[PDB]
Design an enzyme around this catalytic site. Structure first.
Site, PDB file in Angstrom:
ATOM      1  N   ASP B 321       0.811  -1.215   0.000  1.00 61.40           N
ATOM      2  CA  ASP B 321       0.000   0.000   0.000  1.00 61.40           C
ATOM      3  C   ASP B 321       0.844   1.264   0.000  1.00 61.40           C
ATOM      4  OD1 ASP B 321      -2.191  -1.895   0.493  1.00 61.40           O
ATOM      5  OD2 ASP B 321      -1.598  -1.792   2.586  1.00 61.40           O
ATOM      6  N   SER B 346       2.226   6.983   0.456  1.00 63.12           N
ATOM      7  CA  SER B 346       1.396   6.249   1.405  1.00 63.12           C
ATOM      8  C   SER B 346      -0.047   6.174   0.874  1.00 63.12           C
ATOM      9  CB  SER B 346       1.438   6.950   2.765  1.00 63.12           C
ATOM     10  OG  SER B 346       0.537   6.360   3.684  1.00 63.12           O
ATOM     11  N   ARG B 347      -0.442   5.012   0.369  1.00 58.31           N
ATOM     12  CA  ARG B 347      -1.754   4.880  -0.261  1.00 58.31           C
ATOM     13  C   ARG B 347      -2.938   4.959   0.725  1.00 58.31           C
ATOM     14  NH1 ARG B 347      -1.232   1.386  -5.870  1.00 58.31           N
ATOM     15  NH2 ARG B 347       0.968   0.794  -5.726  1.00 58.31           N
ATOM     16  N   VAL B 348      -2.690   5.500   1.915  1.00 53.99           N
ATOM     17  CA  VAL B 348      -3.735   5.645   2.928  1.00 53.99           C
ATOM     18  C   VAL B 348      -3.788   7.094   3.407  1.00 53.99           C
ATOM     19  CG1 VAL B 348      -4.204   5.154   5.339  1.00 53.99           C
ATOM     20  CG2 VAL B 348      -4.084   3.295   3.703  1.00 53.99           C
TER      21      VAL B 348
ATOM     22  N   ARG F 181      -5.566  -5.557  -4.962  1.00 53.78           N
ATOM     23  CA  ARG F 181      -5.518  -5.522  -3.497  1.00 53.78           C
ATOM     24  C   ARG F 181      -6.856  -5.806  -2.825  1.00 53.78           C
ATOM     25  NH1 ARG F 181      -2.514  -1.645  -5.591  1.00 53.78           N
ATOM     26  NH2 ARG F 181      -0.307  -1.393  -5.012  1.00 53.78           N
TER      27      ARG F 181
END
Ligand SMILES: Nc1ncnc2c1ncn2[C@@H]1O[C@H](COP(=O)(O)OP(=O)(O)NP(=O)(O)O)[C@@H](O)[C@H]1O
Ligand SMILES: Nc1ncnc2c1ncn2[C@@H]1O[C@H](COP(=O)(O)OP(=O)(O)NP(=O)(O)O)[C@@H](O)[C@H]1O
Ligand SMILES: Nc1ncnc2c1ncn2[C@@H]1O[C@H](COP(=O)(O)OP(=O)(O)O)[C@@H](O)[C@H]1O
Ligand SMILES: [Mg+2]
Ligand SMILES: [Mg+2]
Ligand SMILES: [Mg+2]
Lengths: 86, 484, 28, 66, 466, 467
Positions: B321, B346-348, F181
């Site tokens: 992620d 940061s894919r969040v 994902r």
């Protein structure tokens, strides 16, 4: 005297570090002069108990190879295999 | 109960018998050696030996276990150091392993989960502001050797003291640390580092190293996963760090090639993706209906000359992620920890910060990817309009901020403190060559004076106009007291 | 000169138990 | 489980005639001694070479400078 | 018992035992030649045949020909009756000085030091080589690696270290020559007899020599790295002593592996290497270590094929070191010896808590200006020096001095440099740079710092020119 | 009939049949599992044996285990009762809501819409994303592809696509996450229940979900896309409807195919893909189409392995598209999301006789000036900026404006950007650029076009940045 006090709090700190070192010297010497025997008895109780439990082997290889009456206690315990399993 | 050995070499035993052996089921060897089935073929089972295959000889005896491979689990492991199969190796006599989980567990599907919302703090200004991780996230650490890839994962566990020596049962984070491929001389020196800073207590450390057999490195990061799966599946918070997957992959390659599975790119086998994919999916943020428990995973990858086209580094990036890149160039240049903001993602996003950080650094990640490009365009000494004269007049100072020492995390509160200093423009008039003697003071000055403000922001995790107001003076009460 | 200022700020058993118990800068 | 609980007894009818046979580590032969001297050197290493029975005197040293 | 050669190819031979069958690792013994031809089992092919790696030429062998199991691994002399003697890969002696009468023996293979035995003792080992000390210092009882392509000066550097280190050193040293130049051995031998580390007269000798050079078969090169390994191992354990292990060239070990992996019948891996490059290495490698018991300071020269630092061989090896010194042709070609890449050599002890943050500060300060120079490297090449900003014109000049003051005329190549062999102590190393960095010397010509000792010889030189 | 496992490696199990040799493609049944295991037949090695791919992991199987010829190809819950429901590789539901209830089932291995069924009608589907609409508009009921290296915004784009295009749509949508994902599926379920395109209560669900993520075997991933399209193939052929089929990530299909190919007996081909990468794609893209009977707007996202647009996977995908949006790392790296390469993105309907001379002439004018700026790019940045023409500092000025005005705060990206979402109607896009191009804003500074919506919202930031 600013360029002259970093050195007056360097000596008041370069002796704080040597007088702490001599206080952990005696530990690293004293606790050592006996933590030695903590080991001169460690290799001793083990090594002996190696030859001790190993000595078991050669006296049991002598018990079956010899004692023709330890060839009877052979067919014995073993025929009690076939049974149980089934 | 099981049968013969057809032939043995290179950790690969062919076996004529075992006719009812499960694929992936672990066998046991004459000499008492645990092996493993992987090739169930017509006339033999190829078995990957889990150790020195000198003891094995043609003809030996292989016996079933019936079991797919499994390992010790639970708090009875913390503070220890176990090999890839769970066995203790720190010479402290077995672990209290009542709990015994299987390595080969598939990962949580769609429902058992919930969006990653839980801040997993690293205590590294750089990471916690510009690429923030959260509990359940997979964030990859990737970089050339000796760039600082590990002093990331270490500085992070050493940060979890604060939370694990307290009351709040959510902020607590137990740590696993797989060590694949490294040298014992290091694994150790590292445990010693943990121990010293006192963190070893909350931290499993599974270690399959250089000298350990091939299938043992193959398996190690999985084992270390199961151990972390427990902590999540039972309502607690785990952070496992695989260091590194690069070395693991290599190992899997060996097994695979010796098993005569035709080779692919760079010699690796086809499923060399599946390998890291599946392992890395097993980290999740379980939804309430399942414990609320998490498993944050920091995999680690090592690149050659920076080549992120290399089979592997491209695979693992497609999986995690997001990631932090390292770069020796920045390192020596002074930017320690060498990160490369613009290339780290940061894919969040903020969904994993406090609303305290978010307010000081939520659009500063798309700012240090434009102040970047807008100092690489006007590099030369000329003229630029009223808009782009400032962006540079700022950034140089800002970067001097994420410049951080080693083995010295920071609690989120303090991070918000310094970040505030600049971002709100209370540094926008200072010579960068000082912005460190500065921070090193203004932060021990506002811990000795106002445990007050920290108290609030630390707890409610936000900066109310209240908290903000106090700051707005504590700052000002310093620039004028030094230069002006 | 100041770097030497920041390193320093950081630092038979009864025969052993009974036997167990710089200023030339106020010038120059 | 009933023809095996007494074969585990062929192991202390000897364990017996050993942890009682005093007169020296049994039947040793030469081997027994030599090795108990090599490990008497290396175990006399990490520590030092002085007297392990006495309390060490104390030489002291001044504080260096960089 | 007995069995027979049924297949021979290169150093790979296939023996058939009807009765019994040797464990994998048992040295076999060929019966029929005027020359001890040890085989070494490495595989059981089944049908009661084994596959073995020779330890010498196999011209002559025939399908037929008997072989006797030795019941053991290849085992060699170990102990103090080795010091002063040159021995080959199977223990045989080769200094034509009779046999090596010795109490005990060891096998060349052996499991590696368990985790509990590791030691985190990190103390600096000064070399008196400016670059190494200032930027990536060696550590006592540490693993050290010298990376270099053909001709960048690994061997010279290992020699200088052997001199500035193992000459005034109370303790045993072992030198394993693995697949390099036979004439380099003859050269070492004599050089160490004159200097008297080896003594033909006594048993006052402080060094053991193990040699298997680039003229011997794969098998031999394959293994000899371990022979010399085993020797050092003893001196560490059954002596709890300070051991110095020098190898040159550890690469030839993996290479030789490669040569055999082909006919052993493995499937080729990346770049043609053996499937087993990482562990084949790592087993062998992890035995070279300092434990609680003894203490080995290892120094291994590592060849880099076609200068490819990513070639699996050099590439994998990096994992195993505590300090690394990397040599670049690029540098050497500018007459900057020793050819050390300042931004690519590293030590796991460049750490203020270990070296004292004056050291750590002058280091990363050099390491910075250098890597700042290196960034300008491109614009200077296309537009020229002049287009350089004023600030930058400096960053160059200073850096370029540093670049030059890391050169240091070794006491060996007194022959190539002609210049007198200097050895600079940590103090004056750290000092001199600090000064250069604080620009006390922006008034001196570049050359003034090229090939000198302490910073005096620098400022001193600058005069003789004027 | 009944068959017995003869051998098992990784994901490829051979099986032997007394009598009933199953035809290639035929789904087989593994008797004795705590969870269903299917084996799509793949070849006849002969001697009554068949090699097969597993649609789940073979951990546990044993030489001789019982296998049953399910008589025909994998079959799935095609039908209207799939909406709001998370299906999978083999039909089995996995949102935990007990059997999907329909009495119509179709094999996922169909043939492909013959020549004569091809529809030639193409009309501009506006997306409100400026860059796509201006320079490469998608077409109602056409094959669209989203090209991207890792991390460049491929997936986010497809979200903001399903948000915009698939909400103001009264037809049926089928989103199928192949090989990516699992986190991101859970992530969408809940956004798609907050918006309630999926409604748990009624039956107003407009969205079938098929899923097979990077945690499943090669068998699964190789076929997950075959399923999700069988699902959307029904909603087309029947309804005559407007089916929106999203895939993410159609790449994982060929990769998955790769992983087993080795173990299936294939000399590898270039870059080490299957010798069949080509046709595998063909007899499968050729199904994701629009017949006379119905229409399927398709939005695939393609991974570009290492960004190499020539890598035989993304490379072969291009033939199968009508409009391709290609994503650039170098653009993204500059903060210009959505990182669309305005010079690698292409539409079939960018024809003045389709979009009008105003639209066309305006797109191409933007394309041109950006290209010209790219040309001055290594003069200026290494040989003094102001050494440029008057004409050129001008075409640089405007270009960088145009180049930034091309960014958009996405509504699904507020979490990252920091600005409230946006969306521009085609004609305000054309107008916006036409202006910038025309020299009407050469006075407003750069950042004013960075991340705004309709052109005026830049004149807004034009003063907000001022005073
Ligand atoms: N923030 C920092 N500031 C100064 N030095 C640092 C910092 N972080 C790491 N280092 C140093 O840089 C070195 C490399 O750190 P490390 O974590 O081992 O990177 P790495 O890529 O994992 N090395 P390796 O395991 O061989 O690949 C160390 O020996 C540190 O002391
Ligand atoms: N440290 C040095 N100082 C000055 N000149 C050197 C130095 N090292 C090497 N040279 C010169 O370059 C040559 C190479 O030395 P050498 O140490 O043998 O390189 P190498 O690492 O051994 N490559 P090779 O031995 O062929 O595998 C010498 O013979 C010298 O003429
Ligand atoms: N619309 C956007 N606006 C701003 N940033 C974006 C946008 N889309 C993507 N990004 C950035 O790119 C990253 C990766 O997005 P993603 O679409 O998942 O890559 P991939 O193409 O491999 O699926 C995000 O996490 C984000 O920081
Ligand atoms: Mg590391
Ligand atoms: Mg050499
Ligand atoms: Mg994605």
């Amino acid at each position: 005297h600013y360029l002259f006090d970093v050195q007056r709090n360097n000596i008041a700190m370069a002796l704080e570090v040597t007088y702490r070192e001599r206080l952990h010297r005696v530990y690293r010497e004293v606790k050592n002069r006996l933590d030695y025997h903590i080991s001169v008895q460690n290799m001793m109780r083990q090594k002996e108990q190696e030859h001790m439990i190993n000595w078991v082997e050669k006296r049991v290889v002598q018990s079956i190879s010899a004692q023709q009456e330890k060839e009877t206690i052979a067919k014995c315990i073993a025929d009690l295999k076939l049974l149980s399993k089934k | 109960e099981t049968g013969r050995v057809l032939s043995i070499g290179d950790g690969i035993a062919r076996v004529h018998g075992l006719r009812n052996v499960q694929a992936e089921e672990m066998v046991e060897f004459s000499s008492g050696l645990k092996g493993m089935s992987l090739n169930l073929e017509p006339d033999n089972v190829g078995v990957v030996v889990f150790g020195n295959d000198k003891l094995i000889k043609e003809g030996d005896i292989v016996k079933r276990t019936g079991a797919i491979v499994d390992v010790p689990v639970g708090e009875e492991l913390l503070g220890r150091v176990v090999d890839a199969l769970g066995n203790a190796i720190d010479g402290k006599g077995p672990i209290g392993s009542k709990a015994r989980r299987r390595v080969g567990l598939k990962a949580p599907g769609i429902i058992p989960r919930i969006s990653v919302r839980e801040p997993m703090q690293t205590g590294i200004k750089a990471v916690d502001s510009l690429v923030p991780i959260g509990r359940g996230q997979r964030e990859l650490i990737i970089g050339d050797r000796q760039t600082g890839k590990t002093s990331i994962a270490i500085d992070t566990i050493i940060n979890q003291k604060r939370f694990n020596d307290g009351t709040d049962e959510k902020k607590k984070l137990y740590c696993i640390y797989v060590a694949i491929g490294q040298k014992r001389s290091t694994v150790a020196q590292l445990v010693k580092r943990l121990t010293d800073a006192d963190a070893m207590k909350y931290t499993i450390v599974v270690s399959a190293t250089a000298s350990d057999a091939a299938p043992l490195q193959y398996l190690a990061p999985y084992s270390g996963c199961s151990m972390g799966e427990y902590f999540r599946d039972n309502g607690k918070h785990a952070l496992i760090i695989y260091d590194d997957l690069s070395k693991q992959a290599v190992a899997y390659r060996q097994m695979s090639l010796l098993l005569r599975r035709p080779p692919g790119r760079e010699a690796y086998p086809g499923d060399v993706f599946y390998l890291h994919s599946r392992l890395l999916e097993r980290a999740a943020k379980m939804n309430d209906a399942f414990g609320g428990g998490s498993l944050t995973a920091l995999p680690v990858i090592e690149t050659q000359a920076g080549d992120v086209s290399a089979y592997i580094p491209t695979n693992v990036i497609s999986i995690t992620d997001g990631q932090i890149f390292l770069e020796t160039e920045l390192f020596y240049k002074g930017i320690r920890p060498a990160i490369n903001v613009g290339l780290s993602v940061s894919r969040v996003g903020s969904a994993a910060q406090t609303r305290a950080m978010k307010q000081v650094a939520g659009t500063m990640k798309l700012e240090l990817a434009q102040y970047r490009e807008v100092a690489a365009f006007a590099q030369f000494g000329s003229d630029l309009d009223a808009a782009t004269q400032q962006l540079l007049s700022r950034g140089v100072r800002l970067t001097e901020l994420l410049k951080q020492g080693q083995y010295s995390p920071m609690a989120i509160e303090e991070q918000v403190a310094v970040i505030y200093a600049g971002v709100r423009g209370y540094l926008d008039k200072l010579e960068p060559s000082k912005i460190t003697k500065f921070e090193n003071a203004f932060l021990s000055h506002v811990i000795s004076q106002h445990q007050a403000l920290l108290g609030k922001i630390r707890t409610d995790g936000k900066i109310s106009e209240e908290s903000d107001a106090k700051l707005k003076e504590i700052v000002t009460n310093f620039l004028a007291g030094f230069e002006a | 000169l100041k770097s030497w200022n920041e390193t320093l700020t950081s630092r038979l058993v009864d025969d052993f138990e009974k036997k167990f118990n710089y200023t030339a800068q106020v010038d120059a | 489980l009933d023809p095996v609980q007494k074969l585990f007894v062929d192991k202390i009818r000897e364990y017996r005639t050993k942890r009682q046979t005093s007169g020296g580590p049994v039947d040793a032969g030469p081997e027994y001694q030599q090795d108990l001297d090599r490990e008497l050197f290396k175990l006399k290493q990490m520590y030092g070479k002085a007297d392990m029975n006495t309390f060490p005197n104390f030489t002291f040293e001044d504080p260096k400078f960089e | 018992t007995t069995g027979r050669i049924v297949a021979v190819i290169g150093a790979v031979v296939d023996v058939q035992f009807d009765e019994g069958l040797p464990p994998i690792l048992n040295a076999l013994e060929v019966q029929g030649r005027e020359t001890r031809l040890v085989l070494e089992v490495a595989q059981h092919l089944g049908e009661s045949t084994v596959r073995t790696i020779a330890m010498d030429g196999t011209e002559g062998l025939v399908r037929g020909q008997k072989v006797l199991d030795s019941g053991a691994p290849i085992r060699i002399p170990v102990g103090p009756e080795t010091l002063g003697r040159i021995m080959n890969v199977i223990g045989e002696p080769i200094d034509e000085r009779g046999p090596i009468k010795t109490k005990q023996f060891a096998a060349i293979h052996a499991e590696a030091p368990e985790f509990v035995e590791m030691s985190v003792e990190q103390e600096i080992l000064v070399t008196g080589i400016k670059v190494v000390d200032l930027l990536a210092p060696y550590a006592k009882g540490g693993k050290i690696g010298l990376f270099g392509g053909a001709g960048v000066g690994k061997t010279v550097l290992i020699m200088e270290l052997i001199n500035n280190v193992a000459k005034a050193h109370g303790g045993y040293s072992v030198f394993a020559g693995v697949g390099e130049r036979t004439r380099e051995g003859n050269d070492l031998y004599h050089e160490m007899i004159e200097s008297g580390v080896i003594n033909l007269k006594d048993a006052t000798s402080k060094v053991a020599l193990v040699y298997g050079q680039m003229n011997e078969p794969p098998g031999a090169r394959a293994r000899v790295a371990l022979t010399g390994l085993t020797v050092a191992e003893y001196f560490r354990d059954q002596e709890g002593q300070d051991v110095l292990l020098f190898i040159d060239n550890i690469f030839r070990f993996t290479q030789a592996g490669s040569e055999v992996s082909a006919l052993l019948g493995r499937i080729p891996s990346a770049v043609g290497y053996q499937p087993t490059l990482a562990t084949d290495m790592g087993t062998m490698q992890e035995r070279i270590t300092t434990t609680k018991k003894g203490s080995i300071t290892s120094v291994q020269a590592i060849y880099v094929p076609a200068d490819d630092l990513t070639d699996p061989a050099p590439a994998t090896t990096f994992a195993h070191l505590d300090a690394t010194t990397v040599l670049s042709r690029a540098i050497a070609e500018l007459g900057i010896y020793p050819a050390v890449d300042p931004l690519d050599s590293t030590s796991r002890i460049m750490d203020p808590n270990i070296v004292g943050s004056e050291h750590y500060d002058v280091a990363r300060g050099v390491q910075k200006i250098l890597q700042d120079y290196k960034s300008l490297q491109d614009i200077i090449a296309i537009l020229g020096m002049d287009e350089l900003s004023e600030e930058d014109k400096l960053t160059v000049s200073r850096a370029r001095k540093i670049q030059r003051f890391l050169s240091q005329p070794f006491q060996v190549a007194e022959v190539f440099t002609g210049h007198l062999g200097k050895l600079v102590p940590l103090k004056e190393t750290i000092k001199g740079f600090q000064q250069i960095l604080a620009g006390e010397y922006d008034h001196l010509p570049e050359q003034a710092f090229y090939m000198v000792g302490p910073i005096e010889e620098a400022v001193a030189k600058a005069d003789k020119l004027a």
